[model samples]
Target chain A: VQIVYKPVDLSKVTSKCGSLGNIHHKPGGGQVEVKSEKLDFKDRVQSKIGSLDNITHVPGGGNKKIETHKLTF
Target chain B: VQIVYKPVDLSKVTSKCGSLGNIHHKPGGGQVEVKSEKLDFKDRVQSKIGSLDNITHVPGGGNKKIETHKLTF
Candidate 1:
């Protein structure tokens, strides 16, 4: 799964990951998190890269973050 | 799952479905296929209908085919 933000001007943003309730934040910058037991660390990183490539950053300077989480049962 | 097309002015187009690799094409007009073990025939048809409803056709002339496929473990 891919999570792309549409550029927000907020100072801080909080996001949750997985059913285990992992919380992450970006105080002033942009960040992404991935949590999945089915995917290995390398696979998770690859998935994140693939998802990040799909993100389109708009002009005029807007803060944004792209997160990717791969899950398996 | 739903598959939607955004108005392509082409005579023929090919698409793949599932991990089994099912190939489908629009010979002249438009067509849709649904293959699933989890969803019933009625559910598959309903999914197709929902996908078709989300399609946005362009002006002039165009062809569209919406397919739905569900998988079960």
Candidate 2:
């Protein structure tokens, strides 16, 4: 039985809002002006796990321990 | 722009235990006797995302909301 350890980040989910703003100046509350900065730290963790026959995720707290039927090809 | 909300259970994580016991009676921790029952209710909520151009998963306290570029084909 040949087994090996592999590291990959297969993100399960993420989100993004689509639109444009900034007309005359910073807009907010339709009254108060507030500068809107583009959102950062938004890209979900990505994994290099090219392919997998199966996968398993053991969730603890807010983190998940994921493993797969190990195969790098 | 036509936006829609879709309901789907794309489980991001789960767990299970595998083994064989209950020999000569309920097996214990090598001392304590206990019954061995096959693990149940262990399936990462799969999705019917046939051909997805994109997907999103919003995680929350032990739960998550998943959305995708709406397509039923």
Per-residue lDDT over A1-73 for candidate 2, one digit per residue giving the tens place of the 0 to 100 score: 3333333344453322222122121111122122324423333332211112222222222333343332222
Clashes of each: 0, 2
RMSD (Cα, Å) of model 2: 30.6
> Compared with the true structure, what per-residue lDDT tens digits does model 1 show for residues B8-60?
22233222222221222212122323333432222212111111111111111
Question: Top model by TM-score, which number?
Answer: 2
lDDT of each residue in B22-64, candidate 2, tens digit only: 2121111122122324423333322221112222222222333
In terms of TM-score, how similar is model 2 to the real structure?
0.13
In candidate 1, what are the lDDT values of residues A1-73, reduced to their tens digit?
3322222232232222222212222121222232323321222121111111122121221223333323222
- What local distance difference test score does each model get? 0.23, 0.27
